Amino acid sequence: ILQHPDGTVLKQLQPPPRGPRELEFYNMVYAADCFDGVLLELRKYLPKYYGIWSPPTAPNDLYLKLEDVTHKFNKPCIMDVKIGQKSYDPFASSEKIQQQVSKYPLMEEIGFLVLGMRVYHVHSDSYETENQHYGRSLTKETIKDGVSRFFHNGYCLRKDAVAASIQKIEKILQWFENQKQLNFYASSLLFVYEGSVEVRMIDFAHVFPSNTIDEGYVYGLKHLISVLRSILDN
Numbered sequence: 001i002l003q004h005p006d007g008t009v010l011k012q013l014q015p016p017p018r019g020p021r022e023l024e025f026y027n028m029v030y031a032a033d034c035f036d037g038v039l040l041e042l043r044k045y046l047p048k049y050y051g052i053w054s055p056p057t058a059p060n061d062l063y064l065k066l067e068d069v070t071h072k073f074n075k076p077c078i079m080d081v082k083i084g085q086k087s088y089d090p091f092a093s094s095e096k097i098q099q100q101v102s103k104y105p106l107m108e109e110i111g112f113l114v115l116g117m118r119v120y121h122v123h124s125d126s127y128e129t130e131n132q133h134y135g136r137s138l139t140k141e142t143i144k145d146g147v148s149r150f151f152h153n154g155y156c157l158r159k160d161a162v163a164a165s166i167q168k169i170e171k172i173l174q175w176f177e178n179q180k181q182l183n184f185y186a187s188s189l190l191f192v193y194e195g196s197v198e199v200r201m202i203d204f205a206h207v208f209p210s211n212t213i214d215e216g217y218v219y220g221l222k223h224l225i226s227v228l229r230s231i232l233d234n
């Protein structure tokens with residue numbers, strides 16, 4: 001992810017098949033002549049899409065130009081959460097499945113994994129960051145405190161941002177409860193709040209056509225909402 005002051009990000013396509021699949025996802029959802037009610041509603045929850053982009057002198061080098069969801073914030077607090085029970089897709093080999101489950105074997109039980117967070121601390125005027133090892137170290141005993149950390153600014157728990165996050169996730173959940181045409185593996189929610197609220201879906205290299213409800217995604221969203229709700233009682 002490269003941030004541009006124009007308020008966009010350039011996301012370099014991942015190696016095939018992942019990068020091309022992400023491109024096709026955006027192209028399908030944002031098809032100008034698309035009138036599919038499901039997909040028009042989905043647009044609300046994605047970064048705005050500005051098309052494929054490559055450097056003037058390098059047509060080989062493919063990027064997606066996307067809305068920078070963090071741009072409108074002064075001190076954005078950012079958390080990336082992978083959603084679902086499975087972070088491998090329906091075409092994964094035994095070996096790849098094992099690779100993916102190995103990365104976080106609690107995915108089936110918890111239904112989400114914190115990929116990272118960056119939290120503005122008011123008292124020190126500084127950011128505290130967690131990397132991928134943080135979320136992969138969380139268990140059923142520790143997930144609630146693990147998520148809470150995102151919303152702690154050094155002096156208070158930001159229950160306002162927690163509640164707003166629940167309200168925004170609930171709309172995404174409603175979208176998922178009302179579509180049976182796409183299943184999403186290894187995709188994420190990006191949470192952003194002002195540390196001095198956004199909740200958007202990102203990372204679409206493993207989105208596949210389906211004829212059923214995305215039950216792993218729904219389980220994950222519901223578990224995540226339940227955790228957030230519990231935090232409101234702290």
Ligand SMILES: Cc1cc(C)cc(-c2onc3ccc(C(=O)O)cc23)c1
Nearest residue numbers: 009047066067068069070080202203
């Ligand atoms: C600073 C920062 C960190 C992090 C972790 C994410 C983003 C981010 O802001 N707008 C985005 C749109 C799409 C994607 C994406 O990955 O597709 C990422 C975005 C920005």
